[PDB]
Short mmCIF file of C-alpha atoms in Angstrom, two decimals:
data_model
loop_
_atom_site.label_atom_id
_atom_site.label_comp_id
_atom_site.label_asym_id
_atom_site.label_seq_id
_atom_site.Cartn_x
_atom_site.Cartn_y
_atom_site.Cartn_z
CA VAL E 3 6.79 -11.45 1.77
CA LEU E 4 8.43 -14.56 0.39
CA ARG E 5 7.69 -17.18 3.03
CA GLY E 6 5.42 -17.07 6.06
CA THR E 7 5.23 -19.38 9.08
CA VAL E 8 1.70 -20.96 9.48
CA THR E 9 1.04 -23.33 6.48
CA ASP E 10 -1.77 -25.68 5.33
CA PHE E 11 -1.71 -28.96 7.29
CA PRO E 12 -1.02 -31.99 4.99
CA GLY E 13 -3.86 -34.58 5.15
CA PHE E 14 -6.16 -32.28 7.10
CA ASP E 15 -9.74 -33.25 7.94
CA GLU E 16 -12.38 -30.63 8.74
CA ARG E 17 -14.71 -33.12 10.41
CA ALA E 18 -11.98 -34.57 12.69
CA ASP E 19 -10.69 -31.09 13.68
CA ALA E 20 -14.25 -29.80 14.36
CA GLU E 21 -14.72 -32.85 16.54
CA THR E 22 -11.37 -32.15 18.32
CA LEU E 23 -12.57 -28.61 19.35
CA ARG E 24 -16.11 -29.87 20.18
CA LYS E 25 -14.50 -32.32 22.64
CA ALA E 26 -11.98 -29.61 23.68
CA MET E 27 -14.74 -27.33 24.87
CA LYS E 28 -17.60 -29.75 25.61
CA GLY E 29 -18.52 -29.36 29.22
CA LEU E 30 -16.92 -28.18 32.37
CA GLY E 31 -13.64 -26.55 31.75
CA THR E 32 -11.85 -26.46 28.41
CA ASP E 33 -8.68 -28.24 27.18
CA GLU E 34 -7.06 -25.00 26.34
CA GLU E 35 -4.00 -26.85 25.10
CA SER E 36 -5.74 -28.97 22.39
CA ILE E 37 -7.50 -25.87 21.05
CA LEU E 38 -4.33 -23.79 21.03
CA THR E 39 -2.20 -26.58 19.39
CA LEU E 40 -4.75 -27.28 16.65
CA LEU E 41 -5.59 -23.86 15.45
CA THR E 42 -1.88 -22.88 15.24
CA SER E 43 -1.11 -25.96 13.00
CA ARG E 44 -3.67 -24.93 10.40
CA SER E 45 -3.64 -22.34 7.72
CA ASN E 46 -6.53 -19.85 8.19
CA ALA E 47 -8.10 -21.54 5.15
CA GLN E 48 -8.40 -24.78 7.05
CA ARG E 49 -9.67 -22.77 10.13
CA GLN E 50 -12.67 -21.70 7.99
CA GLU E 51 -13.48 -25.24 6.95
CA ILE E 52 -13.34 -26.47 10.52
CA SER E 53 -15.95 -23.72 11.36
CA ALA E 54 -18.23 -25.04 8.56
CA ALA E 55 -17.87 -28.70 9.70
CA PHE E 56 -18.45 -27.53 13.32
CA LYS E 57 -21.58 -25.71 12.19
CA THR E 58 -22.91 -28.64 10.06
CA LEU E 59 -22.05 -31.38 12.63
CA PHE E 60 -23.29 -29.63 15.81
CA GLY E 61 -25.45 -26.67 14.72
CA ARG E 62 -23.02 -24.52 16.67
CA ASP E 63 -20.78 -21.51 15.93
CA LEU E 64 -17.22 -22.35 16.77
CA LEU E 65 -16.22 -18.71 17.31
CA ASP E 66 -18.89 -17.87 19.91
CA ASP E 67 -17.95 -21.14 21.67
CA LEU E 68 -14.26 -20.19 21.71
CA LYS E 69 -15.30 -16.79 22.94
CA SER E 70 -17.43 -18.07 25.84
CA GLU E 71 -15.16 -20.82 27.07
CA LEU E 72 -11.82 -18.97 26.54
CA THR E 73 -10.78 -15.78 28.37
CA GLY E 74 -8.39 -12.87 28.18
CA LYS E 75 -5.63 -12.47 25.63
CA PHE E 76 -5.82 -16.09 24.51
CA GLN E 77 -9.53 -15.64 23.72
CA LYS E 78 -8.62 -12.43 21.87
CA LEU E 79 -5.76 -14.18 20.04
CA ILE E 80 -8.01 -17.11 19.06
CA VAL E 81 -10.75 -14.79 17.78
CA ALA E 82 -8.04 -12.91 15.79
CA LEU E 83 -6.45 -16.10 14.48
CA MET E 84 -10.02 -17.18 13.45
CA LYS E 85 -10.94 -14.01 11.51
CA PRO E 86 -10.76 -15.06 7.78
CA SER E 87 -7.47 -13.81 6.17
CA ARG E 88 -9.49 -11.82 3.62
CA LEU E 89 -11.27 -10.05 6.48
CA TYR E 90 -8.72 -9.44 9.30
CA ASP E 91 -7.31 -6.00 8.32
CA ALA E 92 -10.67 -4.24 7.46
CA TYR E 93 -12.12 -5.77 10.67
CA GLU E 94 -9.28 -4.21 12.60
CA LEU E 95 -9.47 -0.91 10.67
CA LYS E 96 -13.17 -0.72 11.49
CA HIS E 97 -12.34 -1.49 15.09
CA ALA E 98 -9.79 1.31 15.10
CA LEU E 99 -12.19 4.14 14.24
CA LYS E 100 -15.62 3.46 15.53
CA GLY E 101 -17.01 5.34 18.43
CA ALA E 102 -14.41 7.37 20.28
CA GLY E 103 -12.31 9.06 17.70
CA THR E 104 -9.78 6.77 16.07
CA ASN E 105 -6.66 4.86 17.17
CA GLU E 106 -4.27 6.58 14.86
CA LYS E 107 -1.61 3.94 15.45
CA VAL E 108 -3.57 1.01 13.84
CA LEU E 109 -4.57 3.30 10.95
CA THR E 110 -0.97 4.49 10.29
CA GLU E 111 0.24 0.80 10.75
CA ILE E 112 -2.09 -0.93 8.32
CA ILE E 113 -2.40 1.75 5.70
CA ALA E 114 1.34 2.41 5.59
CA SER E 115 2.68 -1.22 5.48
CA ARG E 116 0.25 -2.76 2.95
CA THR E 117 0.76 -2.99 -0.87
CA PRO E 118 -1.67 -1.20 -3.35
CA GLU E 119 -2.99 -4.71 -4.24
CA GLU E 120 -3.65 -5.37 -0.53
CA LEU E 121 -5.26 -1.95 -0.06
CA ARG E 122 -7.63 -2.49 -3.04
CA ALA E 123 -8.55 -5.71 -1.26
CA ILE E 124 -9.08 -4.04 2.20
CA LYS E 125 -11.10 -1.25 0.57
CA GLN E 126 -13.55 -3.63 -1.10
CA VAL E 127 -14.08 -6.08 1.72
CA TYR E 128 -14.45 -3.23 4.25
CA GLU E 129 -17.31 -1.63 2.35
CA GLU E 130 -18.96 -5.04 1.82
CA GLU E 131 -18.89 -5.69 5.54
CA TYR E 132 -19.72 -2.33 7.05
CA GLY E 133 -21.46 -0.50 4.21
CA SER E 134 -19.54 2.78 4.48
CA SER E 135 -16.52 3.42 2.29
CA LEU E 136 -13.25 3.07 4.33
CA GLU E 137 -12.14 6.24 2.61
CA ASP E 138 -15.02 8.29 4.08
CA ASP E 139 -14.61 6.70 7.51
CA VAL E 140 -10.92 7.72 7.65
CA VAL E 141 -11.66 11.26 6.39
CA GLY E 142 -14.47 11.39 8.95
CA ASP E 143 -12.33 10.47 11.91
CA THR E 144 -8.97 12.09 11.07
CA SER E 145 -7.82 15.57 10.04
CA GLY E 146 -5.54 17.75 7.97
CA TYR E 147 -2.28 16.42 6.56
CA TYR E 148 -2.35 13.06 8.29
CA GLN E 149 -5.77 12.72 6.78
CA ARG E 150 -4.35 13.69 3.38
CA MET E 151 -1.42 11.22 3.43
CA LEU E 152 -3.69 8.38 4.56
CA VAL E 153 -6.12 9.28 1.74
CA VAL E 154 -3.33 9.40 -0.98
CA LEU E 155 -2.31 5.89 -0.08
CA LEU E 156 -5.88 4.66 0.35
CA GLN E 157 -6.20 5.52 -3.42
CA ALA E 158 -3.85 2.50 -4.06
CA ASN E 159 -2.18 4.24 -7.03
CA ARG E 160 1.64 4.06 -6.75
CA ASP E 161 3.64 3.92 -9.96
CA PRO E 162 4.93 0.58 -11.37
CA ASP E 163 8.56 -0.13 -11.11
CA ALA E 164 9.91 0.58 -14.52
CA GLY E 165 13.56 1.41 -15.19
CA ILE E 166 14.59 4.33 -13.03
CA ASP E 167 14.98 7.77 -14.63
CA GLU E 168 17.90 9.09 -12.59
CA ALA E 169 16.99 12.68 -13.59
CA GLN E 170 13.66 12.31 -11.76
CA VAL E 171 15.50 10.73 -8.83
CA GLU E 172 17.86 13.85 -8.58
CA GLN E 173 14.76 16.07 -9.17
CA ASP E 174 12.48 14.44 -6.47
CA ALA E 175 15.42 14.44 -4.00
CA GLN E 176 15.73 18.16 -4.60
CA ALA E 177 12.04 18.87 -4.23
CA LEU E 178 12.26 17.20 -0.82
CA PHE E 179 15.31 19.13 0.31
CA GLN E 180 13.94 22.49 -0.92
CA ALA E 181 10.50 21.64 0.76
CA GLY E 182 11.86 20.44 4.06
CA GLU E 183 15.30 21.61 5.24
CA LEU E 184 15.75 24.49 2.72
CA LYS E 185 12.21 25.82 3.43
CA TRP E 186 11.27 27.99 6.47
CA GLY E 187 8.43 25.90 7.59
CA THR E 188 7.80 22.70 5.63
CA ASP E 189 5.90 22.05 2.41
CA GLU E 190 4.17 18.80 3.62
CA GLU E 191 2.06 18.70 0.44
CA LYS E 192 5.23 18.04 -1.68
CA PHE E 193 6.23 15.36 0.78
CA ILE E 194 2.84 13.55 0.64
CA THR E 195 2.80 13.66 -3.14
CA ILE E 196 6.32 12.23 -3.79
CA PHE E 197 5.95 9.57 -1.06
CA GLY E 198 2.45 8.43 -2.33
CA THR E 199 2.90 8.46 -6.09
CA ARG E 200 6.39 7.16 -6.64
CA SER E 201 7.22 3.49 -7.31
CA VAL E 202 9.06 1.86 -4.48
CA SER E 203 12.26 1.40 -6.52
CA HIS E 204 12.38 5.08 -7.43
CA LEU E 205 11.82 6.20 -3.89
CA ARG E 206 14.68 3.99 -2.62
CA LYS E 207 17.02 5.75 -4.93
CA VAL E 208 15.43 9.05 -3.84
CA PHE E 209 16.18 8.44 -0.18
CA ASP E 210 19.79 7.52 -0.96
CA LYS E 211 20.55 10.59 -3.10
CA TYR E 212 18.65 12.81 -0.55
CA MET E 213 21.35 11.74 1.95
CA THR E 214 24.13 12.65 -0.64
CA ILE E 215 22.47 16.05 -1.11
CA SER E 216 21.83 17.08 2.54
CA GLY E 217 23.76 14.70 4.77
CA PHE E 218 20.51 13.82 6.52
CA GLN E 219 18.75 10.49 6.14
CA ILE E 220 15.14 11.24 4.93
CA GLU E 221 13.68 10.07 8.30
CA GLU E 222 16.12 12.41 10.28
CA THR E 223 14.69 15.31 8.10
CA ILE E 224 11.10 14.07 8.66
CA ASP E 225 11.97 14.02 12.41
CA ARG E 226 13.27 17.52 12.35
CA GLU E 227 10.40 18.76 10.20
CA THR E 228 6.93 17.27 11.12
CA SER E 229 4.82 16.91 14.22
CA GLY E 230 1.74 14.99 15.46
CA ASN E 231 0.40 11.96 13.76
CA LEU E 232 1.89 13.09 10.39
CA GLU E 233 5.36 12.34 11.65
CA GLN E 234 4.11 8.84 12.56
CA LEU E 235 2.76 8.20 9.12
CA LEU E 236 5.56 9.71 7.04
CA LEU E 237 8.07 7.73 9.14
CA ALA E 238 5.99 4.54 8.69
CA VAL E 239 5.65 5.08 4.90
CA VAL E 240 9.46 5.58 4.41
CA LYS E 241 10.20 2.50 6.58
CA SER E 242 7.82 0.34 4.53
CA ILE E 243 9.34 1.56 1.20
CA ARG E 244 12.67 0.46 2.55
CA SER E 245 11.31 -2.83 3.94
CA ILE E 246 7.88 -3.91 5.09
CA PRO E 247 9.36 -6.99 7.10
CA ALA E 248 11.82 -4.73 8.87
CA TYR E 249 9.14 -2.07 9.56
CA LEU E 250 6.62 -4.43 11.13
CA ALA E 251 9.35 -6.15 13.14
CA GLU E 252 10.29 -2.75 14.57
CA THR E 253 6.59 -2.06 15.34
CA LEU E 254 6.43 -5.45 16.97
CA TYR E 255 9.59 -4.71 19.05
CA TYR E 256 8.20 -1.45 20.44
CA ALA E 257 5.03 -3.30 21.46
CA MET E 258 6.92 -5.54 23.89
CA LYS E 259 10.05 -3.64 24.94
CA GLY E 260 8.85 -1.90 28.07
CA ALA E 261 7.00 -2.46 31.31
CA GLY E 262 4.00 -4.00 29.53
CA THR E 263 3.09 -5.35 26.14
CA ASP E 264 0.75 -3.66 23.62
CA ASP E 265 -0.90 -6.96 23.31
CA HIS E 266 -3.22 -5.68 20.66
CA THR E 267 -0.28 -4.78 18.28
CA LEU E 268 1.66 -7.98 19.13
CA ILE E 269 -1.47 -10.12 18.43
CA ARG E 270 -2.37 -8.01 15.30
CA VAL E 271 1.04 -8.02 13.53
CA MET E 272 1.64 -11.70 14.41
CA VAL E 273 -1.69 -13.13 13.33
CA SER E 274 -1.86 -11.00 10.13
CA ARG E 275 1.68 -11.65 8.75
CA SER E 276 1.55 -15.37 9.62
CA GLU E 277 0.69 -16.52 6.13
CA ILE E 278 2.39 -13.56 4.34
CA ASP E 279 5.90 -12.95 5.77
CA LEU E 280 6.43 -13.56 9.55
CA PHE E 281 9.60 -15.50 8.82
CA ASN E 282 11.22 -12.56 7.02
CA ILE E 283 10.17 -10.24 9.89
CA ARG E 284 11.80 -12.58 12.47
CA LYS E 285 14.99 -12.49 10.39
CA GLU E 286 14.90 -8.71 10.64
CA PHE E 287 14.09 -8.90 14.41
CA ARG E 288 17.27 -10.92 14.98
CA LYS E 289 19.40 -8.89 12.57
CA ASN E 290 18.41 -5.41 13.48
CA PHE E 291 16.67 -5.63 16.87
CA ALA E 292 19.14 -7.74 18.93
CA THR E 293 16.92 -10.47 20.44
CA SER E 294 15.14 -13.18 18.46
CA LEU E 295 11.39 -12.63 18.38
CA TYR E 296 10.82 -16.07 19.90
CA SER E 297 12.92 -15.09 22.88
CA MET E 298 11.21 -11.67 23.40
CA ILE E 299 7.63 -13.09 23.10
CA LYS E 300 8.56 -15.81 25.68
CA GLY E 301 9.97 -13.16 28.04
CA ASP E 302 7.04 -10.64 27.67
CA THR E 303 4.12 -13.00 27.25
CA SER E 304 2.14 -15.40 29.46
CA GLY E 305 0.78 -19.00 29.71
CA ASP E 306 -1.78 -20.12 27.09
CA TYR E 307 -1.62 -16.91 25.18
CA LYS E 308 2.11 -17.15 24.83
CA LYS E 309 2.06 -20.91 23.98
CA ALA E 310 -0.01 -20.06 20.97
CA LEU E 311 2.08 -16.92 20.00
CA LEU E 312 5.34 -18.88 20.32
CA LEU E 313 3.81 -21.64 18.18
CA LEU E 314 3.35 -18.90 15.58
CA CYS E 315 7.12 -18.74 14.94
#
């Protein structure tokens, strides 16, 4: 988070842009290109003014039009790129639980890579929209320690970064070692607590001295010591303390690299970080993950859908 990639269009006009999509969909067929080009050149803020102009000028809902005319992944990208920035994550969190169980991946992903500020936001807007408290929905669809870690973090209460009391850094490093590797079994409760409470700065120093103390990197210990979805989460938490841009880039890489593309993660990460930090993420894609993100989207993606995704970086 420093710089994003989609930005507010200079000398924008709601009324003109509403008219450009009204033309773009009016009638037989759709000019998929003019839609796709327009919506990518606007901040989400502007995308919400175009929907108001489109409603006042034509008595029509732009999103249901986009949805009827457009198809497949491009439709799904356009709906996602239309969801108001203040509403996209809780909308996706809600979509991750309801009905058949929960998609633990989206839950781990969002709740582990978002700041306490962002989580207070998601928590409020979610309840406004859906009535139930996000906290009870998660509890209600998950279980045990994965539940617990998700709930710690959902409480949005990490410590501020103050100066770092090196004693406490030696001391938390030790609690980890003695709870994980030096313990026959694993004291996951000590893990959840240190990783949820501690300020990011502290924890960085903790992970470094943990290495000094055991030889292991904290995620090689976590690997060796936890199973199920808890591994997922603890590994996603650590990675975000170290670097949210890096973490999401990695999550984005694993979505594409293979015989298929988890389109839903590639659309989600992309659309959501667009105004926050997609640039930074791309930098990490090229540095760490070998190929530039532009090049891997191009190679894994398709037609209209990909024209829009590639216009997102």
